[PDB]
Amino acid sequence: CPEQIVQLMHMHLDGDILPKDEHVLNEHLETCEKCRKHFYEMEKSIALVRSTSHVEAPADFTANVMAKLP
Amino acid sequence: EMMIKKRIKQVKKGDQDAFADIVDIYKDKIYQLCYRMLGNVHEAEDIAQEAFIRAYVNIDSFDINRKFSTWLYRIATNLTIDRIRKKKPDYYLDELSNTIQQKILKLPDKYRTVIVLKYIDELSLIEIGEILNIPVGTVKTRIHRGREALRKQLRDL
């Protein structure tokens, strides 16, 4: 996969592709199977990382914070 | 926010009970940031508290012009980057979630930070820039590099 279209992959994921350059990227995926696997791996990774957003502070966190103030 | 800034005016005049309201609002996210940066319950909890305690003690130096969450995120962020570096043994010479956590730690802290704020904490490129004190262009670079290192670690899960 050439680096020039990988930059477009990142531009899609940033959410600031130009509509002129949005049609350019889609062409490479269906055709270039090396650029299709690359993009699939990135989206799969992004999706697994987002599933780790469930964490809450410990039960007595704010009592413990108040106790330590000068 | 109107709720928050009204709470900050109250702490600066003496109302310590207003600060608990501030802690209660951000504790999960701040502890989340620290925990996903450090991968360790005892260190994250220590650092997350330190963030709020330092936020309270420095509250008369905070400009109410600016966004309070940015300011708080910046304290926590600096405290966590600080621990990751001093953790490295030679610093002073000169389950599914659990599995992804271990991968997150293999990212250098400059790309770890942007990945956590962007994808776990859902912050804008603008706020990350302000938080880390860098222009939006630099943030985008690190995200791109972070995405890439992250793909290497996670593609086979």
Author numbering:
A (entry chain C): 3 to 72
B (entry chain A): 2 to 95, 125 to 187
The authors write:
SigW is one of ECF sigma factors in the gram-positive model bacterium Bacillus subtilis. Its activity is suppressed by the anti-sigma RsiW under normal growth conditions. The cytoplasmic domain (RsiWcyto) interacts tightly with SigW to inhibit SigW activity. In the structure, RsiWcyto interacts with the groove formed along the surface of two domains in SigW (σW2 and σW4), resulting in the burial of the promoter binding area of SigW.
